[PDB]
Amino acid sequence: GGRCLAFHGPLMYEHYQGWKSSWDEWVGYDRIRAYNEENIAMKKRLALQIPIKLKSVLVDDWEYVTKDKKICRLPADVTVEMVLNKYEHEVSQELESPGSQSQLSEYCAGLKLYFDKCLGNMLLYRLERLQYDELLKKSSKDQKPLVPIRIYGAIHLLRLISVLPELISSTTMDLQSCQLLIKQTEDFLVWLLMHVDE
Amino acid sequence: NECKFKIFINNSMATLKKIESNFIKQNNNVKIFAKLLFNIDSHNPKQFQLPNYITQIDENSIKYDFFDKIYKSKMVQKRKLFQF
Amino acid sequence: SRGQYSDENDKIGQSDSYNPDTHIDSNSGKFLICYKCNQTRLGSWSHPENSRLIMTCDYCQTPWHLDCVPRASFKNLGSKWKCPLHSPTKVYKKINYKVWKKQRLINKKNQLYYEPLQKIGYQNNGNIQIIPDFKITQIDENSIKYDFFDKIYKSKMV
């Protein structure tokens, strides 16, 4: 099946095509395609915004990060693991339509790989920046990777998910992806409307 | 990171060829946002501001994930027939 | 010849009697097993009545008996013999209705655009290809079964 499937450089394989029969070989070694070795080295080198429902908390936290920064303990007791696993047990079976929990679970896994990587670009204050450098320096004494799950609170969740939509628009994709994105942030605000203690 | 990005890709290599066209085969649980992860070094960091308006093991992974999803679907079906 | 529409749906003792050459393919010499009944049913020269006429598909070369699908004899003149296994050109759903006359494919050139972004709730309305403007997306088996299970779970109670 198909039109291009060969372990070596492709020659419209559906054996070395375009050559005589006395060149075949069926040895078993490593196989790499590499797009015909970059086409024989280029022919031998040429010969949108969130709804206004709970808008007060972000305005309150905008002034709060000027001198208090909403956190004073480096080993903060409030983490994201249990409050994250909560949605797979309460609102995935109640609020969303009955069916598959992909739209919540896969997005949560994406939020893991976004939270483990997003540090360094964007959601940072100056004092937060020196705190991040001091955390990196004190975490480099045992050459271990820096896990931002156990040393960061969950109160920044709404600000990263509200600065997310204007950086979706930086690249080009379809519009129903943005529809589903704003729908899941709307569901997040729907949940966090009641639970204000977290 | 901007200097690294250009010196790595933007200078003379793979200008027309898409780099992020083959990262799907090794990355899992990445479906909603995929294009924005590639150009994370193309923009310089800036201070905080606010506007005045405001595949072998991956197949096994998704198979066990879908098995867990099916079991959870059975469990919420049981819950809905209990509550109905 | 005269300037009519001719897509890939249109095709370009023998006449009765025994035809074992129709049961034998020249590509490999193996036996053409039908989809519905897992037999070729060549029969014997002593019992010609046990033999059943078979035909191959013009697209996927799928063997088929003349008794399983409703069909009397072969298709030699007219459009290509389309076995009822591929995507139909005309569909009908009463809601007035949607016909959805496919897209009849386009060239390999820059008019063909690929954009694999989302697998669940993509709203691609068909027109997809399977991998291991006319906006088409890369579609695998996991996406297909996932959207099916979401759809028939959300559509059971209706």
UniProtKB/Swiss-Prot annotation, chain A:
It comes from Saccharomyces cerevisiae (strain ATCC 204508 / S288c) (Baker's yeast). Pfam families: MRG, MSL3_chromo-like. Component of the NuA4 histone acetyltransferase complex composed of at least ACT1, ARP4, YAF9, VID21, SWC4, EAF3, EAF5, EAF6, EAF7, EPL1, ESA1, TRA1 and YNG2. This is Chromatin modification-related protein EAF3. Component of the NuA4 histone acetyltransferase complex which is involved in transcriptional activation of selected genes principally by acetylation of nucleosomal histone H4 and H2A. The NuA4 complex is also involved in DNA repair. Present with 1890 molecules/cell in log phase SD medium. Residues 48-198 form the MRG domain. It is found in: Nucleus. Belongs to the MRG family. InterPro entries: Chromo-like_dom_sf (IPR016197), Chromo/chromo_shadow_dom (IPR000953), MRG (IPR008676), MRG_C_sf (IPR038217), MRG_dom (IPR026541), MSL3_chromo-like (IPR053820).
Swiss-Prot record, chain B:
It is found in: Nucleus. Present with 486 molecules/cell in log phase SD medium. Coiled coil: none annotated. It comes from Saccharomyces cerevisiae (strain ATCC 204508 / S288c). The chain holds residues 304 to 569 of 684 of the full protein. It comes from the Eukaryota. Component of the RPD3C(S) complex composed of at least EAF3, RCO1, RPD3, SIN3, and UME1. This is Transcriptional regulatory protein RCO1. Catalytic component of the RPD3C(S) histone deacetylase complex responsible for the deacetylation of lysine residues on the N-terminal part of the core histones (H2A, H2B, H3 and H4). Histone deacetylation gives a tag for epigenetic repression and plays an important role in transcriptional regulation, cell cycle progression, DNA damage response, osmotic stress response and developmental events.
